[PDB]
Ligand binder design. Structure first.
Ligand code: HEM
Ligand code: HEM
Ligand SMILES: *[C@@H]1O[C@H](CO)[C@@H](O[C@@H]2O[C@H](CO)[C@@H](O)[C@H](O)[C@H]2NC(C)=O)[C@H](O)[C@H]1NC(C)=O
Ligand code: NAG
Ligand code: CA
Ligand code: CA
Lengths: 141, 172, 143, 168
């Protein structure tokens, strides 16, 4: 569960992510595709090569969704209701892929923000990404 | 052999599974006993085994368990619904979906290490160890497993509420 | 699965600059902070409530050094991981009852620590190689 | 919303109709003594003038009317989160400190992060409130802001703002 201190740390970390969110998400998607190729089965229509414009656009969309979740950290299920329905029903993405993407996002943030990825901030960001994944995987069946 | 659902399975998330033949009871297979009392009194710690997903959202290879204490009922409806009064209840679940909360269910919060039950843990008994007679009782059956770590409470349907129905079902 | 020579070279080159005395302690402290149930196995290490207490714990640092040395030992024998980790897996399964998923969690946390330490040098290719490495270590350390 | 914690005991009043000039709370019409369709998460709490002892000040600015905005709540000084902080809030603050309000910018001019508490967040002033705490805002201290987000104002009489292009 996200404590108020954890919410503060997540808000600060994503604020210092700032405008680099789109390419952070693109890098996280690339890391998920390379490290865990089993997640590529959910993108059969995407060009999954390095530096892909389509992967970059999807990473921008993912980071915009994460920004909306951070801004609505107290109402995340309502903020991600459309995405929850989408991932759970239309795409039927298995939650292990969500945890893999959360790990890859954490790796990207650690590689790009080493000064601000403190163990407390790392734990808070992991909790926030777990909350996002749980909201998106809740309706999975 | 057959599966029978609770008649009010929309309010009491229970279904009964009947095997073709009686299983051979040994040190690894043994039925839990249905409680004669209500061990769901707030503060009681029961052991929730589970075959569900883990911190990586991967279905656990080995059986695990947690020692979740039953939480205050009012805190649980207030956590999921709005204000424990029907005219002010709102879908306030920290997770996407809403649990089935009524008089037939209790709630057990996370343990002291912020660990809870995740997807696939539903149907697992809230096993409570009665130290007086050294017997393990299924105080509740985990109904809401979507509380992996975001929602602070997992919802367990009281077995004592369903005890009368299951015993009538064992007869036939 | 066999690890490609390019991936092996990348892993070895990135591990050459790894601070053995600090990276393992950092990874273990991060594991105990992010996943507090892992503090259950280190109740003899003293205070582990505050994240600063976890990261500043001398016993945690020493055990992280030992864990990272075990990672290095498994790295030198990437092609034979079950044989090298048989004794440690038996220890964790029987004497300590550590869930195998904790090994995967520690591998992911170690990958996060390596990325945090090496910045952009932790490229997605070398991260994939290290994910293969930590998956092999965890599988060899499990069951 | 039981921000001061969840109370215990029987809820006494549910729908109090008070116009303001009442000698005591148990004098409004309400709808009964103990009759309520409520929970203990709906316990109402209040903050009073002589207890809060509120005052506003500007710290670490290039002028006595610029820099980081700091508000005192219950005897301890704290900053203001810049979330929801806009020109109307700055105008209200400038008119509250009683110094030029011709142009009221936001953001601390050069001040570093404040120290201590962060009291106000998402202050929603219409521009006419006598002070910054009569505006609609989140509860005192209930936010997820850090001190890098400290709100500030730049009270100027539209005369000492100069712009130019240099180097071309
Ligand atoms: C924190 C985790 C995640 C976030 C924030 C997220 C967010 C998003 C967003 C914003 C979209 C755009 C949908 C639209 O615009 O209609 C999307 C689509 C999609 N997502 Fe995710 N997602 C996450 C996890 C995942 C994972 C792990 C996978 C697969 C392994 C996945 C698979 C997909 C697919 C296949 C689409 C459809 C894109 C397309 O058809 O072009 N999602 N997601
Ligand atoms: C993932 C890779 C891991 C490696 C390579 C590793 C390696 C080691 C090593 C070298 C030892 C010392 C053996 C000895 O002293 O005889 C050890 C012991 C131990 N490990 Fe691990 N470990 C790993 C993961 C974990 C995890 C995830 C946990 C807990 C969540 C854990 C808990 C322990 C404990 C409690 C001990 C004994 C502490 C003591 O002897 O004082 N290990 N491990
Ligand atoms: C922001 O700028 C103001 C104005 O320059 C600084 O205040 C001055 O601080 C110096 C000390 O170095 C004093 O000698 C001046 O008298 C101050 N001027 C005024 C108008 O107060 C202030 O220190 C700066 N804040 C920072 C850099 O954090
Ligand atoms: C189902 O609900 C009805 C009324 O709500 C009740 O009479 C009946 O006993 C319930 N079913 C069982 C099996 O208890
Ligand atoms: Ca009412
Ligand atoms: Ca802000």
């Amino acid at each position: 569960v996200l404590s108020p201190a954890d919410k503060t740390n997540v808000k600060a970390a994503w604020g210092k992510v700032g405008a680099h969110a789109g390419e952070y998400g693109a890098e996280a998607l690339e890391r998920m595709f390379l490290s865990f190729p089993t997640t590529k089965t959910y993108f059969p229509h995407f060009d999954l090569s390095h530096g892909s414009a389509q992967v970059k656009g999807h990473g921008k969309k993912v980071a915009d969704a994460l920004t909306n979740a951070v801004a609505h950290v107290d109402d995340m299920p309502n903020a991600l209701s459309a995405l929850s329905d989408l991932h759970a029903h239309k795409l039927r993405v298995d939650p292990v892929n969500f945890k893999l993407l959360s790990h890859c996002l954490l790796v990207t943030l650690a590689a790009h923000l080493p000064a601000e990825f403190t163990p407390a901030v790392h734990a808070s960001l992991d909790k926030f990404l777990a909350s996002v994944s749980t909201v998106l995987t809740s309706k999975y069946r | 052999e057959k599966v029978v659902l609770h008649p009010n399975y929309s309010q009491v998330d229970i279904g009964l599974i009947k095997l073709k033949q009686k299983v051979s009871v040994n040190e690894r297979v043994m039925p839990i006993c249905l409680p004669s009392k209500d061990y769901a009194e707030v503060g009681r710690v029961g052991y929730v085994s589970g075959w569900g997903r883990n911190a990586n959202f991967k279905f656990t290879d080995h059986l695990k368990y947690v020692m979740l204490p039953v939480a205050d009922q009012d805190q649980c409806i207030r956590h999921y619904e709005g204000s424990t009064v029907p005219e002010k209840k709102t879908p306030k679940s920290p997770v996407g979906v809403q649990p089935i909360l009524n008089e037939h269910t209790f709630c057990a919060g996370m343990s002291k290490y912020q660990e809870d039950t995740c997807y696939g843990d539903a149907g697992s008994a809230f096993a409570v160890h009665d130290l007086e007679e050294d017997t393990w009782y299924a105080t509740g059956i985990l109904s809401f497993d979507k509380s992996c770590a975001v929602a602070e409470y997992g919802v367990y349907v009281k077995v004592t509420s369903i005890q009368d129905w299951v015993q009538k079902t064992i007869a036939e | 699965v066999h690890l490609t020579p390019e991936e092996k070279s990348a892993v070895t080159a990135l591990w050459g600059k790894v601070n053995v005395d600090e990276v393992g302690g950092e990874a273990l402290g991060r594991l105990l902070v992010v996943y507090p149930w892992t503090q259950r196995f280190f109740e003899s290490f003293g205070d582990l409530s505050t994240p600063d207490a976890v990261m500043g714990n001398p016993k945690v640092k020493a055990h992280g050094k030992k864990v990272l040395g075990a990672f290095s030992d498994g790295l030198a024998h990437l092609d034979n991981l079950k044989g090298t980790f048989a004794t440690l897996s038996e220890l964790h399964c029987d004497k300590l009852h550590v869930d195998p998923e904790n090994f995967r969690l520690l591998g992911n946390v170690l990958v996060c620590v390596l990325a945090h330490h090496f910045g952009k040098e932790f490229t997605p290719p070398v991260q994939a190689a290290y994910q293969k490495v930590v998956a092999g270590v965890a599988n060899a350390l499990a069951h | 919303s039981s921000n001061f914690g969840e109370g215990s005991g029987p809820i006494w009043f549910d729908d109090l109709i008070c116009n303001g000039n009442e000698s005591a709370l148990w004098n409004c019409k309400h709808q009964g003594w103990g009759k309520h369709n409520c929970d203990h998460a709906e316990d109402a709490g209040v903050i009073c003038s002589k207890g809060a002892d509120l005052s506003l000040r500007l710290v670490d600015g290039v002028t006595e009317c610029s820099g980081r905005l700091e508000v005192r709540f219950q005897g301890e000084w704290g900053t203001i989160c810049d979330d929801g902080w806009d020109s109307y809030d700055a105008a209200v603050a400038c008119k509250q400190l009683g110094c030029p309000t011709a142009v009221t910018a936001i953001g601390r001019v050069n001040a570093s992060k404040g120290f201590g508490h962060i009291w106000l967040d998402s202050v929603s002033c219409q521009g006419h409130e006598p002070a910054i705490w009569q505006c609609k805002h989140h509860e005192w201290g209930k936010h997820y802001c850090n001190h890098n987000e400290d709100a500030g104002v730049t009270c100027s009489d539209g005369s000492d703002l100069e712009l130019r292009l240099r180097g071309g």
